């Protein structure tokens with residue numbers, strides 16, 4: 001990984017030491033990217049709902065992961081499940097349960113720093129993983145992107161600024177998540193969102209993560225050509241809002 005400090009450095013070391021899990025997936029991979037494109041062609045809002053019990057910014061809720069997944073399955077394009085242990089209180093067991101219990105594609109949401117974590121995603125039933133440009137050297141991104149592809153996944157490349165986007169497009173990202181979250185500070189900053197979205201070619205599937213909590217914000221971003229919307233905290237606090245987001 002890159003040289004990092006603070007909580008990210010902690011999670012990066014945690015990830016490097018993380019033992020590979022015993023698991024066996026129960027259906028072939030369903031491309032999350034391609035399901036988003038099918039939602040787009042059908043003119044149906046594509047929401048990727050996030051399951052997380054906590055966040056380093058202060059989320060703290062308890063909700064049964066299967067019930068939440070079953071509830072969301074009816075309306076989402078897919079689910080992102082936290083498996084990061086210390087800051088998000090997630091685990092591989094949440095993914096194993098959800099990915100075996102719902103039919104929609106699943107992104108494993110964690111800090112990936114090594115191939116065996118992508119193995120873990122695959123064996124646990126996830127359909128794809130995110131790789132984070134701020135965390136990974138360009139060489140590690142290239143390598144892990146190639147490795148995910150070799151398993152049948154198209155990973156989401158997570159970018160926050162123009163420097164990250166430069167990298168993601170150079171390595172040939174086909175699926176990008178544009179986050180307003182500064183992973184260091186934890187603050188949501190939207191200053192550069194409009195510019196970043198507009199720099200991504202039309203045939204790259206783009207997803208926005210930004211503390212979204214209102215249908216209006218989705219409508220605004222969709223006008224810019226955004227394909228899908230990752231929504232975590234507002235749905236963890238009130239899952240019933242999925243209806244405002246997809247109606």
Ligand SMILES: Clc1cc(Cl)c2[nH]nnc2c1
Pocket residue numbers: 108109110111129130131132158177179181183209230
């Ligand atoms: Cl896997 C992953 C990692 C990060 Cl930092 C993300 N930020 N927004 N969506 C994400 C998915």
Ligand code: NA
Pocket residue numbers: 002003
């Ligand atoms: Na560095």
